[PDB]
Amino acid sequence: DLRLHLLLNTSVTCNDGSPAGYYLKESRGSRRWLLFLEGGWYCFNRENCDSRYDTMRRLMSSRDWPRTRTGTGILSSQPEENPYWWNANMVFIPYCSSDVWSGASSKSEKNEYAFMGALIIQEVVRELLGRGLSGAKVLLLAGSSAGGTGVLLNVDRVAEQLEKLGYPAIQVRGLADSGWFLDNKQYRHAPTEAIRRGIRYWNGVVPERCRRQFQEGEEWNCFFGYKVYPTLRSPVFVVQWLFDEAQLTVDNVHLQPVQEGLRLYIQNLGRELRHTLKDVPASFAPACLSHEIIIRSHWTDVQVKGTSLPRALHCWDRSLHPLKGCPVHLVDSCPWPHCNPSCPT
Ligand SMILES: N#Cc1ccc(Cn2cnc3ccccc32)cc1
Ligand SMILES: *[C@@H]1O[C@H](CO)[C@@H](O)[C@H](O)[C@H]1NC(C)=O
Known part of the structure; x- marks a missing residue:
């Protein structure tokens, strides 16, 4: 179990003004630290945020949070569940x-x-x-x-924060799971508009090099992985299902008798996602219809070209000290959901 701590600086708050915080489990024989950002969509105006406060209040407030939380997947301390980083210091940061x-x-x-x-x-x-x-x-x-998009937006700011505080020896790296989206044409008829409005409502901040490229009024571009990733200096490993359920939801695709128009749309979505990852050296992208993976208990089951995600992350660690039989770039080439047999059922 990870134990809740509310922030000592009570001016740093959740949506409703209650203190933010984190859940922590220390491993005092380890110098590795994993800080995980929860996800859960967003809200971009008063009326939409009021609705979220009625029926998704734990994503807007700490007043009802439990004092403990079980670590699962990459946050598990058991080697059987977490072959990659089971002995690390574990932190879960709730999204409020x-x-x-x-x-x-x-x-x-x-x-x-x-x-x-x-x-x-x-x-x-x-x-x-x-x-x-x-x-x-x-x-x-x-x-x-x-939270995966959050990694892309914040990893270089964390790196700069530790540099300016006097800790140049801590290597900051990123792991973005299911946060790599396309601003593509929908199957039936716009989500970039909600992001553009949200950024104004939130006083949102994007990484500096990306901000300087797209300039005033166009910061929404930096919420899209294939546009912000080339601007980042910290090492970032990208996990993305080729047929992500949240991508299809915004594209107005609902899956059992698929006709030619929808077949071509779905095949083109996978091809475009595969293309945006071709120059990303640390990536894991299976041809499955699903959403999220790294804190799921059975995250060890999926494989690409015979390599599991925990193995791919271990090979990434070794690369940051190419490797024989220890690959780091793993992207499926087959073109339809579940053409990979290891996809979640
Ligand atoms: N065009 C478009 C588009 C808009 C939303 C999403 C899905 N989604 C869910 N949470 C998100 C956070 C940041 C960015 C996207 C996010 C996918 C595509
Ligand atoms: C608390 O957080 C706010 C917002 O970042 C900051 O302005 C303030 O200086 C912080 N207080 C302390 C004592 O660091």
Whole structure:
């Protein structure tokens, strides 16, 4: 179990002004630290955020959070469940800012909600330094869904934070799971509009090099993996199902008798996703219809070209010290959901 700590700086808050926080399980014989960002879509105006507060309040408030949480998947401390990093220090950061981890805006007389995702991550890192993070060799910032996009938006800022605090020896790296989306044409008739509105509502922040490329009014571009990833300097491993369920939801695709128009659409989606990963050297992209993987208990089951995801991440570790029989770039080439036999059922 990981144990809840609310942030000592109570000005860093969830949407409703309650303190943000993190769940921690220390491993004092290890210098590796895993900080995982929860996902769960987002909200981009008053009416939409009010609805979320009624029926998804744990993603907007800490007032009902449990004092413990079980570590699963890559957050499990058992070697059987987690061949990759079972002995690491484990941190789960709950997503209570509804801003894809980009916000830097407090609640005030002019704002009904606070959107402080980017500041929550920095404050977690600051308070963990006093609990052993100062001794680390590697800080892996991981996340799923909106938390996977959050990794892409924040990994270089964490690296800069530790450099300026006087810790140049901690190697900061990223693991983005199910956060690599396409701003493609929908199957039936726009999500880039919701992101563009959200960024204004949240006072959202994007990485500096990406911001300088796309400039004022176009920061929404940096929420899309294939556009922001080339601007990042920290090493980032990308996990993405080729037929991601959240991608298909926004594309208005609902799957059993598929006609030619939809067959071509689905095949073209997989081809385009495969193309955007061709120059990403650390990636794992199976031809499955699914969503999220790294904190699922059975994350060890899926394989690409005979290599599991825990193995691929171990090979990435070795590469950061190509390797015989230890691959790091794994992308399926077959063109239809479940053409890979190891896909989740
Ligand atoms: N065009 C478009 C488009 C819009 C939303 C999503 C799915 N999604 C879910 N959470 C997200 C956070 C950040 C970015 C995307 C996210 C996919 C494609
Ligand atoms: C608490 O967090 C806020 C927001 O980042 C910051 O302005 C303030 O300086 C922090 N307080 C302390 C004591 O670090």
